[PDB]
């Protein structure tokens, strides 16, 4: 089921009577970024989403330096 594009997923579930290919130009979404081919759910594969922290550590350790005494 995840192979269905998000454009037609809403139409299949009787969410609207206007298919995405019949959409008015003003009703379409405007993307400033390029569009790629539809990617289905990637579970049970090597492409599964891997969560990670998007923030740096909250404390930075001291970079050690040596100064010779007089």
């Amino acid at each position: 089921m995840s192979e269905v594009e998000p454009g037609w997923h809403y139409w299949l579930a009787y969410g609207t009577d206007v298919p995405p290919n019949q959409l008015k130009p003003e009703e379409k979404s405007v993307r400033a970024y390029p569009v790629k081919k539809h990617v289905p759910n990637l579970t049970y594969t090597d492409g599964a989403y891997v969560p990670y922290n998007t923030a740096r550590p909250k404390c930075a350790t001291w970079d050690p330096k040596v100064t010779e005494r007089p």
Binding site: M1, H9, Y10, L12, A13, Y14, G15
Partner: protein, 55 residues
């Protein structure tokens, strides 16, 4: 002594399972009716613009 139906009439229903055959007949009527099943994932149930799913 105050029954409206005669003993023979009450026995005929009781011995011949009058209401049981009535219940069987109603169940058989649905056998010749259209079912409700939809063929997911080839078909989807109704959705509304207010529906809450993945963020």
């Amino acid at each position: 002594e105050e029954s409206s139906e005669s003993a023979l009439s009450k026995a005929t229903k009781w011995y011949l399972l009058s209401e049981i055959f009535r219940g069987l007949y109603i169940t058989l009527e649905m056998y010749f009716r259209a079912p409700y099943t939809i063929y997911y994932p080839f078909e989807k149930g109704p959705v509304s613009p207010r529906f809450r799913g993945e963020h």
